[PDB]
Structure 1
Amino acid sequence: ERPTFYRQELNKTIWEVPERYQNLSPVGSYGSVCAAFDTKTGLRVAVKKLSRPFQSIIHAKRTYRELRLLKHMKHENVIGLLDVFTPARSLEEFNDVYLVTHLMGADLNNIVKCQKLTDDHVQFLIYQILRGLKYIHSADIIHRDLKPSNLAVNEDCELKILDFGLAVATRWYRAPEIMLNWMHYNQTVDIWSVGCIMAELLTGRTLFPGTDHIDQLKLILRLVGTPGAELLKKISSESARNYIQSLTQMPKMNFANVFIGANPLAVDLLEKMLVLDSDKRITAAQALAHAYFAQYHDPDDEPVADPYDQSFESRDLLIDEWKSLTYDEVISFVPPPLD
């Protein structure tokens, strides 16, 4: 049943992987990642060894979540699972988890930080992000942590959304309703991140380089304008309401003055993505229909996900229960077909 494993000390940490995976070679660091050759498919792959996956209730739930998410993602613009394995023979000695995914050249950070991109490159890159977001959103998953280092791009300019990238602060791409600590935000927090990402591709500069959460807000409202009465009446917290309307009434900027000389269609999408009011923000699906993607948009080739059960998220279990649920998911893994 079980293939032949082999051991080695790879820098900081030890690895025991099946003989199928050769030429392990460190690439960085939640857990650490190696590059490898997969003799079975001929692919270069990344093997990820989780750091102490079952050391607390938090880790154990996180390990389980991650594994369920990856097993479920089957889509061109979303990282998926090639293989998952443990060197453990039984539940009793189950203590280490390894995940295998496609290896990609660089992240989006690595392309913008060194250059600009032309308008046709942003189109295709953002198009692919919105296409993967459409699929993730359709399973009632929200990403929450979209930023350049979470977008992997190969030398063909093909893009995949990663669940956790390699270690530019997270807050620079966070929606204002999450800065303010709103408990009830929706899927379009992710649209907000995309708007920030696109903006950064188009101009080469972080749109909102806040030093902290207050600075961040200050920088956001300075482009988008302080909230009107229609938004203000939907804010449940007295203090947030006070902070907001305690501030100087900044007017909304014309985006065409901030993004001078960019495609006027790109400026239009951005207007629709960077709305302070979350209820009005364009969705991923709608954004795919926007004129700016005219040369790529195909409604018969932008699929949605199967139903994803996340009832587990509300459960409070013992470390050994999460551990055993995670073992079941390893055991039942069906490899995706070659081709």
Structure 2
Amino acid sequence: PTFYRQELNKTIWEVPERYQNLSPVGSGAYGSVCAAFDTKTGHRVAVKKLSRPFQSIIHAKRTYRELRLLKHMKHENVIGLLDVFTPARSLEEFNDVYLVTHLMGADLNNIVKCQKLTDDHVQFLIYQILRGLKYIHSADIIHRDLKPSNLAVNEDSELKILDFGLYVATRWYRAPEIMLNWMHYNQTVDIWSVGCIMAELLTGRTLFPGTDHIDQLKLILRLVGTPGAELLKKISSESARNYIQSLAQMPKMNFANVFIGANPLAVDLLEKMLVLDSDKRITAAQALAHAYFAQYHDPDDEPVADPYDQSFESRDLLIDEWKSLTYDEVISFVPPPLDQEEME
């Protein structure tokens, strides 16, 4: 293919002539993104140019990790790949990686900001998050930083999870075990985040808008109640345990008294997601069966993922080895069919 060059976000992009009318739509993890028109299919796409993908061993393995992950993700509520390209003609010239996915116009913050969402609409949005999480969790992939800005949404409220499995970030949606560096955690860290997101969609305001990690913890404990000693088991730092143990004891609030006017089924689901005991937190697959989603739930259309080989994560390789592995993954990529779905 013929490539052309265009300066976007103060840097040269070099893209196949197939992709036209590039225009910037913001940064993503380790890269920046442009909307484009795919002249082969007439579809709108988003093209991410990775930032300095092989500048260091950190960047190089992160590039490989992201390409491997995105090549594996094949789910309607998870960002996956339509294309991956490089202007390089050989491994020796290889220094740039571009990832292509279907264009999504907004993030979840664009949906709830200026709109009082109906409960039926909130159900649909949360249902889609949970369907995507069931899929990624089934491949032993955790998001760990799920939040509205990591949920891409289009003009019909269809949603996809992105930046999973990988500047001052919001911590308002992070699971307590992540935010506070507890020693062990499971996939349900992401379910805490869903509870935080769902709460905000129902009330129109942030559930735990803490100014720092201690203020955020205090806000969390005010809702869910002081935890037992067994939860201290998870916290390495004695200073942190002593502090938490020293706090005045707070009762758990009845969520029906907090989310006044909400669908009682929404309140019940929130009670099952927003628990400190991550081993008692509802899983994505269990949440999909909850009656709150009755009008959307369809077990035939809530698939799991093919097994995902993450053995590379434990390996230290040289930069050029990660670069060569990445090049191999670029060259071996097989574009999916344009239409991969059939009537039920």
| Fold equivalence (TM over 0.5) | yes
Instruction: Answer whether contact 1:227 1:276 (CA < 8 A) is retained.
Output: yes
> Structure 1's 109 and 133: CA in aligned 2 closer, same or farther, altered over 3 A?
same
Instruction: Answer whether contact 2:142 2:164 (CA < 8 A) is retained.
Output: no
User: Do structure 1's residue 7 and structure 2's residue 10 form an aligned pair?
Assistant: no
Instruction: Answer whether contact 2:125 2:159 (CA < 8 A) is retained.
Output: yes
SS of the equivalent of 2:257 reads helix
SS of the equivalent of 2:34 reads strand
> Structure 1's 236 and 32: CA in aligned 2 closer, same or farther, altered over 3 A?
closer
SS of the equivalent of 1:171 reads coil
Instruction: Answer whether contact 1:142 1:187 (CA < 8 A) is retained.
Output: yes
Q: Deviations over 1:245-280 (max 9, x none)?
A: 111111111101110110010000000000011110
> Structure 1's 274 and 164: CA in aligned 2 closer, same or farther, altered over 3 A?
closer
Instruction: Answer whether contact 1:81 1:100 (CA < 8 A) is retained.
Output: yes
Any unmatched runs of 5+ in structure 2? 340-344
Offset of 1:33 from its aligned partner?
A: 1.1
Offset of 1:105 from its aligned partner?
A: 1.5
Offset of 1:238 from its aligned partner?
A: 3.6
Instruction: Answer whether contact 1:149 1:166 (CA < 8 A) is retained.
Output: no
Instruction: Answer whether contact 1:35 1:46 (CA < 8 A) is retained.
Output: yes
> Structure 1's 212 and 236: CA in aligned 2 closer, same or farther, altered over 3 A?
closer
Offset of 1:9 from its aligned partner?
A: 2.1
Higher alpha-carbon deviation: 302-311 or 163-172: 163-172
Give the equivalent residue in structure 1 for 2:230. Answer: 230
C-alpha separation in 2, matches of 1:183 and 1:58 = 24
Instruction: Answer whether contact 2:199 2:270 (CA < 8 A) is retained.
Output: yes
> Structure 1's 101 and 166: CA in aligned 2 closer, same or farther, altered over 3 A?
farther
C-alpha separation in 2, matches of 1:146 and 1:24 = 28
Offset of 1:302 from its aligned partner?
A: 0.5
Offset of 1:241 from its aligned partner?
A: 2.6
Higher alpha-carbon deviation: 239-248 or 186-195: 239-248
Instruction: Answer whether contact 1:225 1:253 (CA < 8 A) is retained.
Output: yes
SS of the equivalent of 2:53 reads coil
Give the equivalent residue in structure 2 for 1:252. Answer: 252
C-alpha separation in 2, matches of 1:106 and 1:10 = 20
> Structure 1's 14 and 165: CA in aligned 2 closer, same or farther, altered over 3 A?
farther
Instruction: Answer whether contact 2:77 2:128 (CA < 8 A) is retained.
Output: yes
Higher alpha-carbon deviation: 14-23 or 223-232: 223-232
C-alpha separation in 2, matches of 1:9 and 1:168 = 27
SS of the equivalent of 1:275 reads coil
Offset of 1:8 from its aligned partner?
A: 2.1
Offset of 1:115 from its aligned partner?
A: 2.5
Offset of 1:160 from its aligned partner?
A: 0.9
Provide the alpha-carbon RMSD of the alignment: 1.8
C-alpha separation in 1, matches of 2:188 and 2:323 = 33
> Structure 1's 169 and 6: CA in aligned 2 closer, same or farther, altered over 3 A?
closer
Instruction: Answer whether contact 2:18 2:38 (CA < 8 A) is retained.
Output: yes
Matches within 5 A, 1:39-58: 39-58=39-58
Offset of 1:126 from its aligned partner?
A: 0.3
Higher alpha-carbon deviation: 213-222 or 167-176: 167-176
C-alpha separation in 1, matches of 2:255 and 2:8 = 50
Offset of 1:35 from its aligned partner?
A: 1.1
> Structure 1's 191 and 165: CA in aligned 2 closer, same or farther, altered over 3 A?
closer
Offset of 1:232 from its aligned partner?
A: 4.0
SS of the equivalent of 1:300 reads helix
> Structure 1's 284 and 256: CA in aligned 2 closer, same or farther, altered over 3 A?
same
Q: Deviations over 1:173-206 (max 9, x none)?
A: 0111122211311100000000000000000000
SS of the equivalent of 1:8 reads strand
Offset of 1:314 from its aligned partner?
A: 1.0
C-alpha separation in 1, matches of 2:305 and 2:165 = 22
Give the equivalent residue in structure 2 for 1:178. Answer: 178
C-alpha separation in 2, matches of 1:112 and 1:169 = 20
Identity level (%): 99
SS of the equivalent of 1:152 reads strand
Instruction: Answer whether contact 2:182 2:234 (CA < 8 A) is retained.
Output: no
C-alpha separation in 2, matches of 1:7 and 1:203 = 46
Offset of 1:219 from its aligned partner?
A: 0.7
C-alpha separation in 2, matches of 1:147 and 1:319 = 32
Higher alpha-carbon deviation: 224-233 or 326-335: 224-233
C-alpha separation in 1, matches of 2:155 and 2:59 = 34
Instruction: Answer whether contact 1:85 1:330 (CA < 8 A) is retained.
Output: yes
Offset of 1:170 from its aligned partner?
A: 2.4
Any unmatched runs of 5+ in structure 1? none
Aligned length in residues: 337
Q: Deviations over 1:41-66 (max 9, x none)?
A: 11011111111000111111111111
Offset of 1:113 from its aligned partner?
A: 1.9
User: Do structure 1's residue 74 and structure 2's residue 113 form an aligned pair?
Assistant: no
Q: Which runs of 4+ in 1 moved over 6 A?
A: 164-168
> Structure 1's 77 and 168: CA in aligned 2 closer, same or farther, altered over 3 A?
farther
C-alpha separation in 2, matches of 1:235 and 1:167 = 27
Offset of 1:234 from its aligned partner?
A: 5.4
Q: Deviations over 1:296-336 (max 9, x none)?
A: 11112110000001111111111111111100100100011
Higher alpha-carbon deviation: 244-253 or 177-186: 177-186
* TM-score normalized with structure 1 length: 0.96
C-alpha separation in 2, matches of 1:185 and 1:315 = 22
